[PDB]
């Protein structure tokens, strides 16, 4: 099954289809975080595991800013990783419910800080998957999730 929501790329530098100005990831892993990511350190483990696995990564979180955002962009440009980041849809309680929906749709697990989950301890089994993902300035489309 697929889904779509009104949240565009957090940076035009995630674009990998110049002509159209879109982001297209094939058979990617999907990280679902209910927190704001500002320090990349806590991300290294999952990033390494995904990079070593040879798959692209879509990040859906509260936000991805500062150094965090910058390193993701620079290392995708350097070909060390291939990732894209967007904010979670909706607000408040609706955001949590929708984030959980995507998880179920993709067989992923929401890394909830509320219930005390650590991103450093996140594993590939916690990540979701889908056949394809398309992102533009305004929307994110998940195609055929596991």
């Amino acid at each position: 099954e697929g889904m779509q929501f009104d949240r565009g790329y957090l940076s035009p530098y995630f674009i990998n289809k110049p002509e159209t100005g879109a982001v297209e990831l094939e058979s990617p892993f999907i990280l679902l975080a209910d927190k704001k990511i500002s320090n990349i350190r806590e991300m290294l483990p999952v990033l390494e595991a995904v990079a070593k696995a040879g798959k692209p990564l879509l990040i859906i979180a509260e936000d991805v800013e500062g150094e965090a955002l910058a390193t993701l962009v620079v290392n995708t440009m350097r070909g060390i990783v291939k990732v894209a980041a967007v904010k979670a849809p909706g607000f408040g309680d609706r955001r949590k419910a929708m984030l959980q929906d995507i998880a179920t749709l993709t067989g992923g697990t929401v890394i909830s800080e509320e219930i005390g989950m650590e991103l450093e301890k996140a594993t590939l089994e916690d990540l979701g998957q889908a056949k394809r993902v398309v992102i533009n300035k305004d929307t994110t489309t998940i195609i055929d999730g596991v």
Binding site: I40, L44, E48, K52, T71, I80, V81
Partner: peptide, 11 residues
Amino acid sequence: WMTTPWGFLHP
């Protein structure tokens, strides 16, 4: 900025 053994450049 440092570079992990696998080449990831970060602060």
